[PDB]
Amino acid sequence: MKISSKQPRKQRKFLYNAPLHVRQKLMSAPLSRELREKYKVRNLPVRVGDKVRIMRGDYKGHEGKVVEVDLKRYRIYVEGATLRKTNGTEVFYPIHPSNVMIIELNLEDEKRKKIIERRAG
Amino acid sequence: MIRRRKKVRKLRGSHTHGWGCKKKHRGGGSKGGRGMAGTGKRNKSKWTWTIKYAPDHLGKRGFSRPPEVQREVR
Amino acid sequence: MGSGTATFGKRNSTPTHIRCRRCGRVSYNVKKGYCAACGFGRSRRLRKYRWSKKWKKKKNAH
C-alpha cells in the first residue's frame, strides 16, 4: 500500500531528464563500515579530493583517488581502475558509483562539512 | 466464450462467414431498405415484417387523452 | 492547354509568391499583396479555418 510510480518508463524519464544539481544525490556512495557508523551517515556525494576503493567489477578491494566525477555519464574515474589502451598508455576505466565505496572523505569545504556532521547524523 | 472468429473461422474459411454468396453482403438492399422501411410500402418492400401479426396496419386512429384527465387508480 | 506542356512553360519565370512578412511561409503574393497562407494584406487576422490548414501545423507543433 504505497504512493508510487508503477510506471517504469516514467521512472526512467525522471532519471535522464533530471537537473544537474539533483544528480548529486545519485553520485553518492556508501561509507566504509567503521566511518558509516561513526558519522552515522549512510552515504555522501563523492569528490575528486577523496579517497575511494572500488568494490565491484574486476577490481575488488582495489584503491585509488577519484580523478573526475562526471554527472552526465553517471560514472567516475578512479586511479588503478584502468584499461590498457592499444598504443601504449594506461587510461581510466569509467565505472558507476553504485559499484564503489568511499573509504575516506576530505573536508576542506564548509558546505560538505556542515551536512555530514549535523542533519545527516 | 464462443470465439466469433473460432466459429467464423479462420475455420470455415467459408469467407462468406455465415453470409452466403459473396454478392449478398453489401448495402441497404439486403436489408430491404433501412430499418422499419418497407412496412408502409404498398409496393414490395417489407409488407409482412419480422412481426408475428404482420405488420399491424397503418393508421393509428383514435385519440389521445390529456395526461391530466387520467386519474391514476391502483 | 492540354498536352504540349514543355513547349508552353516559359512562365513561371515571373514570381507572385514569397516569405511573408507576417507568417514566414511561401505565399505573400507580391501582385495581390495577399498572403495565401496567413492572410496578411487581406486581413488583420491570421487565416484559420475549421478544416483547417493553419491549425494543423500548430497542433502538429504541439
Partner: protein, 204 residues
C-alpha cells in the same frame, strides 16, 4: 486519426486498383485497413464494457462461499498454503492481536503459531511475468499469502501491510478479491474475536 491524412483516389487506366493513396507520395493513406498507416478496422472505444453487475444478495452469498472453503482441508492444500497447525482451520486468536501495528511484533507471533511458514511461500516470486507487457508495469513483485481480519484498529493494521503477500482488512470492507483471488478460495485466514462476532450478523 485518418483526418490528418486526407486520402485521394488514384483512378484507373494504369493496371492498379482504385484504392486511395495520398497526393504526391504513393503511400499509406486513410480509409484503409489493408494499408500501412491506415485505420484499424475497429479501434478500441471508451464506450467498451467495464462493469459487470452482480446482485447484493448474490455477492454476499459469494463471500460466504469463499470463507466456508477455508474450513475444508482439501481446498486449503490445493490453494498451496502448507499448514503445521491442521485442526486450526481457520485460526481464531484473542482480541489483542488487532492492536499490534508494528512489523517486528506481528512477525514473532506468527512463528510461534506455526503460521510464519505460509509467508515463506509468499516470498517466492510469482510476478516477474512472461511477455513484453511487464515494461509498462506490474513486474518484480511478490505473491499472495495469509489474509488477516481484525474488528478494530482502523480499516487496516499499520504493520501487517508490510509482510509479504499479506493483505489486511476489517469485516466492514471484506470483498471476494481478498478472500479468494483469481477464483481460488481456500486462502488461510487469521481471525479476531470481535470480527467473528460482527460477521455473525450477516447483512445486505
Amino acid at each position: 486519426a485518418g483526418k490528418r491524412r486526407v486520402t485521394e483516389n488514384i483512378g484507373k487506366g494504369h493496371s492498379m486498383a482504385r484504392v486511395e493513396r495520398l497526393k504526391t507520395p504513393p503511400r499509406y493513406a486513410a480509409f484503409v485497413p489493408f494499408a500501412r498507416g491506415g485505420r484499424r478496422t475497429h479501434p478500441p472505444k471508451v464506450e467498451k464494457i467495464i462493469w459487470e453487475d452482480i446482485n447484493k444478495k448474490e455477492k454476499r452469498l459469494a463471500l460466504m462461499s469463499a470463507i466456508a472453503a477455508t474450513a475444508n482441508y482439501d481446498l486449503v492444500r490445493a490453494r498451496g498454503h502448507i499448514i503445521d497447525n491442521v485442526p486450526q482451520l481457520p485460526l481464531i486468536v484473542v482480541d489483542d492481536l488487532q492492536k499490534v501495528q508494528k512489523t517486528r511484533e506481528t512477525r514473532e507471533i506468527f512463528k510461534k503459531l506455526g503460521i510464519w511458514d505460509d509467508i515463506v511461500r509468499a516470498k517466492e516470486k510469482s510476478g516477474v511475468r512472461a511477455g513484453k507487457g511487464k515494461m509498462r508495469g506490474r513486474r518484480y513483485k511478490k505473491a499472495k499469502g495469509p489474509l488477516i481480519v481484525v474488528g478494530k484498529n482502523e480499516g487496516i493494521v499499520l504493520g501487517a501491510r508490510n509482510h509479504p503477500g499479506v493483505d489486511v482488512v476489517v469485516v466492514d470492507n471484506l470483498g471476494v478479491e481478498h478472500l479468494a483471488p483469481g477464483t481460488h478460495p481456500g486462502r488461510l485466514t487469521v481471525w479476531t474475536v470481535s470480527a467473528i462476532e460482527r460477521l455473525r450478523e450477516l447483512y445486505g
